[PDB]
């Protein structure tokens, strides 16, 4: 009913190999050429990838800034407000980043701040500015 398991034979493949006396060799050579042509091609990209691995030597540890683990505190000092306004100019509504900058403010009190002072600091104008970039 079906070819024994792991034997492979199709109408197309049988027709394919039979067409000509040599079609057999032909077909099997292309597969042999096409193999070496990928084996070499792997050889390259190995070296090539190994080149760029030499360029990443050391890693980025020597560039890791010192960490600041200062606790949240929801009391807005005037400079914290100022840092914020500037963040908006630099980040748009990325309130996560902005809070990262301010350092001791979660991501909400930032949205809060956004909508509390949005009139007095023209945070709409500050956004329109960030936007045009």
């Amino acid at each position: 009913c079906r070819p024994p398991k792991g034997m492979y034979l199709t109408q197309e493949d049988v027709v394919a190999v039979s067409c000509s006396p040599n079609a057999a060799n032909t077909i099997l050579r292309q597969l042999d050429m096409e193999l070496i042509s990928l084996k070499r091609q792997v050889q390259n990209a190995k070296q090539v990838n190994s080149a760029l691995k030499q360029k990443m030597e050391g890693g980025i540890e020597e560039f890791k800034p010192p960490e600041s683990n200062q606790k949240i505190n929801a009391r807005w000092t005037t400079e914290e407000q100022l840092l914020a306004v500037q963040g908006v100019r630099k980040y748009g509504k990325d309130f996560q980043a902005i809070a990262d900058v301010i350092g001791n403010k979660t991501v909400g009190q930032v949205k809060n701040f956004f909508v509390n002072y949005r009139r007095r600091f023209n945070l709409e104008e500050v956004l329109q500015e960030w936007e045009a970039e």
């Binding site: 990928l38 990838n49 890791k64």
Partner: protein, 666 residues
């Protein structure tokens, strides 16, 4: 099976159904109601049984009816009809039996039989048994034909037929009871031993073998499922189909490796692009660090935009460092997934060489069993006679198979050294012209009502003809003779003074160096009491080796065997014989095979008798005059002894029906 069904089976008949042969003789019954059929069958099977239970004494109608019980012996014509049909068609009282009713004083009809083969002898016994007057004409100086059995001293070895391919349904079973053949089972275990001399290990042996068998079922799939049976207006051979399959099997191996490396490169391309992305992050990060440095080096107290500048760059930097750590994690994965792949590659190859040569032996064994190159077997039909294979272990005749023709020969008018040159068959009877093989100026003429021809297919195929038919055989016949295949295979007999081989092993194989020579000496049998080794040449080899001196051939054997068992252990042989069947002019080959382009049909065409046209024109249609038997005439049991033996039984039946008429049909 047991009892009466046992007999139906042991007589190659379905116990629960009437055969076409039976339908033809008992049309009343088979058109009749079920009940009578069951009676008829029982009566048949029962009678068979009785014969089978004791084939050393003629089974008489009396003895038969005697032993039937009612309801069945109520119809005593049916019993006779049946008993008589079985006797005719040699399903009972065939072979060598003690005749209860000494032979009819006076004989009816005259038949000349060509060839003292088994087919010939079995026919001739029957016809004689049926009262006819029979003479056999044989070219050789002995009976048996392709049952040849070398004998010198205690050495005894068959150069033709030596196996009894199973007793389940084999007429030779019966004959073995009537004649002492010393049947010894053959232990199928055959260890192979590469070109060099080194046993093949279990692991290979089985891997390869199973591939062989797999490859065959494959071919079948092409044939039946994909209809791969013609190619460029020529019929596909088993060989072609095997190559094609092997090809495709290789093609797949490659096709898989390809798509494996295609996965490697594609994963490298993932890794590459990530490395650029990572090396440029390296860059931005390195620099962005600087700016943070610089901004942070400005000292407090600072105004807020400068304070912002530090903090801004700090986060912007920690952010990027995070991104890099992540990608270094991703990198670690692609790097290790890259190591899984070049660690776990698909199959390098389909078959090494060392295997593909072992596989070549599994092919020689097939070429040996079919007496022919697989380039020549019909893809569609080479194995049509498969369903009819017997049951039981295969066996050998340990005192030599010639014991059988010789037994059969006993009591027959056989003329040896008589070579038929011409067969003339006319509306009014036939004459056969023969010569003395010894001095061929001497001529004989034999007149007879009928001729039964057991001439080998090789001999029939011969050009120019060894035997002339007058008139010529009709084209329908002569085409079947071309279309059919008549193969070849030879044996070399090595008689030694001591056993230097394993006595618990009957046969063992040698693996040839090349495909083109997987035939040569590829198998050795150790089957006889005396220290004899027998070596087969199969395949394309048998053909070529026929053109090589014996000494050389025997050399090549000792070589092979020295390589297997060591130079100190391989004496010279005391005695050697070497067959050359294709050369042998009374055989011109070894046995039939289903050529590509032929069908089992041709075998039937071979058995159809020939009916000469009328003497005077306008005179009415004659009787059939020229009849054919032999191993090539019997579709379901070709190329065997039993199958010849049966063909002989068949034609005797048919000839007697013709010339003595058949009372049992009413």
């Amino acid at each position: 099976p047991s009892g009466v069904e046992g007999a139906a089976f042991q007589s190659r008949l379905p116990h629960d159904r009437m055969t076409s042969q039976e339908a033809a003789c008992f049309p009343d019954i088979i058109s009749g109601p079920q009940q009578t059929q069951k009676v008829f069958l029982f009566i048949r099977n029962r009678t068979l049984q009785l014969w089978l239970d004791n084939p050393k004494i003629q089974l008489t109608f009396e003895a038969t009816l005697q032993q039937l019980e009612a309801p069945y012996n109520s119809d005593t014509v049916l019993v006779h009809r049946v008993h008589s049909y079985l006797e005719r068609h040699g399903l009972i009282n065939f072979g060598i039996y003690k005749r209860i009713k000494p032979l009819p004083t006076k004989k009816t009809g005259k038949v000349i039989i060509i060839g003292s083969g088994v087919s010939g002898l079995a026919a001739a016994r029957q016809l004689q048994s049926f009262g006819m007057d029979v003479t056999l004409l044989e070219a050789r100086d002995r009976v048996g034909g392709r049952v040849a059995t070398f004998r010198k001293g205690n050495y005894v070895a068959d150069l033709g037929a030596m196996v009894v391919t199973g007793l389940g349904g084999n007429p030779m079973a019966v004959v073995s009871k009537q004649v002492n053949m010393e049947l010894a089972k053959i232990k199928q275990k055959c260890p192979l031993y590469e070109a060099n001399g080194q046993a093949v290990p279990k692991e290979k042996d089985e891997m390869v073998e199973q591939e062989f068998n797999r490859l065959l079922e494959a071919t079948s799939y092409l044939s039946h499922q994909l209809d791969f049976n013609v190619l460029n207006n020529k019929p596909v051979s088993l060989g072609q189909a095997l190559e094609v399959v092997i090809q495709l099997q290789e093609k797949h191996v490659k096709d898989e490796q390809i798509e494996h490396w295609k996965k490697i490169v594609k994963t490298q391309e993932e890794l590459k692009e990530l490395l650029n992305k990572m090396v440029n992050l390296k860059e931005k990060i390195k620099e962005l660090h600087q700016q943070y440095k610089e901004a942070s080096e400005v000292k407090p107290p600072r105004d807020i935009t400068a304070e912002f500048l530090v903090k801004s760059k700090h986060r912007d930097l920690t952010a990027l460092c995070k991104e890099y750590d992540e990608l270094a994690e991703t990198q670690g994965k692609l790097e290790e997934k890259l190591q899984e792949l070049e660690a776990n590659p698909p199959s390098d190859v389909y078959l090494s060489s060392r295997d593909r040569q072992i596989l070549d032996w599994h092919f020689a064994n097939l070429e040996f069993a079919n007496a022919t190159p697989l380039s020549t077997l019909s893809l569609k039909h080479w194995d049509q006679d498969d369903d009819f294979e017997f049951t039981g272990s295969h066996l050998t005749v340990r005192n030599g198979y010639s014991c059988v023709p010789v037994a059969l020969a006993e009591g027959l008018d056989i003329k040896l050294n008589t070579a038929v040159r011409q067969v003339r068959y006319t509306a009014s009877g036939c004459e056969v012209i023969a010569v003395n093989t010894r001095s061929t100026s001497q001529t004989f003429i034999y007149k007879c009502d009928a001729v039964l021809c057991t001439l080998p297919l090789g001999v029939l195929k011969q050009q120019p003809p060894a035997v002339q038919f007058v008139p010529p055989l009709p084209e329908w016949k002569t085409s079947a003779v071309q279309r059919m295949g008549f193969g070849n295979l030879n044996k070399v007999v090595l008689c030694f003074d001591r056993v230097f081989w394993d006595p618990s092993v009957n046969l063992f194989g040698h693996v040839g160096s090349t495909t083109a020579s997987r035939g040569e000496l590829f198998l050795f049998w150790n089957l006889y009491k005396a220290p004899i080794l027998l070596a087969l040449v199969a395949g394309e080899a048998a053909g070529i080796m026929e053109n090589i001196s014996d000494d050389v051939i025997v050399g090549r054997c000792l070589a092979i065997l020295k390589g297997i068992f060591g130079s100190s252990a391989v004496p010279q042989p005391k005695e050697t014989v070497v067959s050359r069947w294709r050369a042998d002019p009374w055989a011109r080959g070894s046995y039939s095979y289903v050529a590509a382009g032929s069908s089992g049909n041709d075998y039937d065409l071979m058995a159809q008798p020939i009916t000469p046209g009328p003497s005077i024109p306008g005179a009415p249609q004659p009787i059939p005059r020229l009849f054919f038997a032999g191993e090539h005439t019997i579709r379901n049991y070709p190329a065997t002894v039993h199958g010849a033996l049966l063909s002989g039984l068949r034609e005797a039946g048919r000839i007697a029906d013709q010339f003595l008429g058949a009372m049992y049909t009413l």
